[PDB]
Amino acid sequence: PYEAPDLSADGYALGSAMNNLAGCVVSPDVNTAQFTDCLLGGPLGGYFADSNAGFTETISNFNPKDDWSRVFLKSDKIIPTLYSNLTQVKLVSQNTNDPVPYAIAQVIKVAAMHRVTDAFGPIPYSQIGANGEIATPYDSQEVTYNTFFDELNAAIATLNENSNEQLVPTADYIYKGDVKKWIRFANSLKLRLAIRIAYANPVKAQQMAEEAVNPANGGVIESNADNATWNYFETSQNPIYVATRYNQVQTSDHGGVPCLTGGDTHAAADIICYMNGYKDNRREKFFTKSEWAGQDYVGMRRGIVIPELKTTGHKYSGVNIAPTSPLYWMNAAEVAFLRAEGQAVFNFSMGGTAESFYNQGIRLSFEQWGADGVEDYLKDDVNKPTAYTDPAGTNTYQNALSNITIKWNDSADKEEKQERIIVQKWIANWQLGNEAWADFRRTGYPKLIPVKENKSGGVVDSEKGARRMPYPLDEFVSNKANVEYAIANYLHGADNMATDVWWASKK
Amino acid sequence: PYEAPDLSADGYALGSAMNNLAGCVVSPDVNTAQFTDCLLGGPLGGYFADSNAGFTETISNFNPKDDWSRVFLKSDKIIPTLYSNLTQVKLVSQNTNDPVPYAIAQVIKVAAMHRVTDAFGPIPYSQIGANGEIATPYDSQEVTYNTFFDELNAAIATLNENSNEQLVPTADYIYKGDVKKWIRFANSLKLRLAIRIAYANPVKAQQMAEEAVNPANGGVIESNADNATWNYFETSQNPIYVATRYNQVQTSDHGGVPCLTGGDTHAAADIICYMNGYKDNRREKFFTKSEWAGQDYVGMRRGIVIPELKTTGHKYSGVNIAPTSPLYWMNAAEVAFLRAEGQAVFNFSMGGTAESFYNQGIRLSFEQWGADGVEDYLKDDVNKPTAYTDPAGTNTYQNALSNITIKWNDSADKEEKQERIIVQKWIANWQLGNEAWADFRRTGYPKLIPVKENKSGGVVDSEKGARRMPYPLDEFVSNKANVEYAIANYLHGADNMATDVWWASKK
Ligand SMILES: [Zn+2]
Ligand SMILES: [Zn+2]
């Protein structure tokens, strides 16, 4: 039946706030998402390559300007937006005697903020102000992670208790206000963060992980239908799409044929080397074809002298994404691969065999992307990642990136089991650069092509890569005593890109 | 069931094109919509008032710069966008042996383009190029209108024949691809254009109007569920919202309380005078409260020395619209009032008594906006529009705008019947400024407050107001022979704002 507008229902005020919160994970603001996800996460995670020759100072070359590296902490579109809206939702939940919106808001808060600590290490968190003021004492990263678990646990408790209630759908382009899906996502995120800390605090990691997958707490994401995917662009412009297409070559400058590969960002060589080697049917779903003769898929190397787009850059495979594409937060495949690693590498009780979880992860990913042939792929014990023959001949890498094969081997050593899991988890997490970067730092997988053009002045290792972002210069201006205290006490290393964050403590 | 992305379905290419077409009626581009609908249609239609004191050259004061008046013809977001996408849809329909998308596209084309001729009079139309090139011979407005009817008729024929088919829903935020709704809208638009020409060609008008409401052709919009409303902003920013809020006063500059009335555009005095007088329960739905003591609703006068927003402008009632609000094209109320006028004023066979259509229009409008009290309103034969006592004391108008009462009087003279119909039609069409402006030019109703600050140098009459926009200056540069020919032969008057367009020929 026809329903009149009612700006007054508010209802309306709530919707604005909840949608604003969701925008704090991956920003709908193009320039913000460009920094956090196209220029930081994508390249550092082995997915994307910078492809504007004018970008002479980059994160991927390890000489970023403050204005590139700082964004997660300094963008008013992130922390101030998150906290201001949190404050409003908390008040709505109180006023309406309905705890559901604030509970979901707390899940979104962790989804947004773990990305921030994962980038810098110690950050302001527990003491952040009502309006997202970060001119406060820092938490150690360990304390931050502890707080994340507490917040998720509280949210999960509230949602479970209100499992029959709902959020108005117009307030939620992830799950349309479905409380049970939010519970699954919250537990899934809890699992992500548990495996993150598996080296740093194995006791806590095991406890959190086993709680996450325990039916008594409402379960994890086990189906693509339940992916944490932000479908907020059906009537506008996906920011990764816009940002990757910035400066794309015009048809009239491309022989009268459109160029489909994008502009400022292309697909990375690394992921394409693996997927080409593996004859992976997901390729056509992830990437645009290259314009290089006889090669359907070839990525641009990360950490090079970036070529001119107009001459050669435009020929490399691009990111296969549309204006109406959603933004991913977390998928079912990742949950399966977390359980696989939990069991195989850390001997956690994940609810099934590691082999079963690994295979299911791959099946979930093929299903997610509509790719056929998963059953033959799963059993492939022959095909290996390729080396990187640059069609331009400038940036060739002579070595196969790894010799790791797809088929599960239950008699493999832990190190090999971990590599296999992370390689497939990484493929499945295409576009979630920040997550890939975190996993690479924690595990050392996948093995990537080392940086060639390392602009760090010897500070950053070409293989180990960027371990973190340096602290924003403004911290030393507006928050000096507090950032200095964090450097001295919580960072456990110099304030530069070579220092590992706390959870990155694998032997 | 879970469905994978498939950018390849195209399917996808079609969706982009169809959504692009819809954007050519009222643009989602904020600055474009600001010009066509906030600064042109809204004020000229008696709905909105310009409220930036820096706007010293305006359409509403009758001294517009070329860059304000030209937009409908010169914006690349309108004609070039429309035609380029039309060309693509035509090819898709051919290639897929499916005529439905092009048929709907033709309805959108007329919806977009009638606004353009209605603004200027003679325009390029029949000869416009594949890419929306307007450097071509002009049509007379009569020829343009003839072409509109032919195009609508062809569309309606195709849709009727394919009444059981569908358009993919992601291609259509008006009707979700429902072919029968599109038929109703097409006939409704045909009726709008038929009544438009009721003075200029009564023979044709009657024929088109009676065809439009004939069941054999599939019917008109008779329910709010079937409104031509573009619900394209649930996840972004309605352009009328953004544009009306430009320069809104900041809370810290407003005594620590938010200001809710907007910035660059406020609600007009005229509509509020009628609605206050009529004790109209739709007021709270249309407008924000004013900040003037003891007065819930008071609009800003149009065509004045525009005051400073910060001092007094911000106190006037604003437009009650949200970021997620849709954009209206045509509603059920309008159809009812077209039928009312058709029967009462022109003796067309509309399918019912004029009284019944008038009352139904008012009922539809109350229902549309969720307003109670329509039954008592309908029977009100006492309450009259007010005069305009400016709370600021600067721009007071001492006369009641009209003495016309709400209740239908079937023994009234045609002139009174027309006024009553148009006044209620005008109220019901809140936000559709261009349409109100057209009706005012054709009928002389509603009676408005005459312009006080008339910046036209004596060219434009303060009561009759702007009769058209002058031709864009670029026409004399890129299309000289053709625009001059149109002035000499088709315009039937000087190229200025005082000359009536062809359909505006009431005695
Ligand atoms: Zn190209
Ligand atoms: Zn105010």
Numbering used by the authors:
A (entry chain A), B (entry chain A): 31 to 537
Paste lines from the article.
The SusD protein family (PF07980) contains over 2000 homologs that are predicted to be involved in nutrient binding and whose presence on the outer membrane predisposes them to be effective antigens.
The crystal structure of the Bacteroides thetaiotaomicron protein BT_3984 was determined to a resolution of 1.7 Å and was the first structure to be determined from the extensive SusD family of polysaccharide-binding proteins. At the time of deposition, BT_3984 was the first structural representative of the PF07980 Pfam family of SusD/RagB homologs and belongs to a PUL with unknown specificity and very limited similarity to the archetypal sus operon. The partially occupied zinc was tentatively assigned based on electron density, coordination geometry and an X-ray fluorescence excitation scan that showed a small peak above background only for zinc. The N-terminal region consists of three typical tetratrico­peptide repeats (TPRs) that form an αα right-handed superhelix. A mostly unstructured region of ∼100 residues separates the N-­terminal TPRs from a fourth TPR located in the C-terminal region that continues the superhelix. The C-terminal subdomain (residues 266–552) is characterized by a fourth TPR (helices H19–H20) and by long unstructured stretches that comprise over half the sequence of this domain.
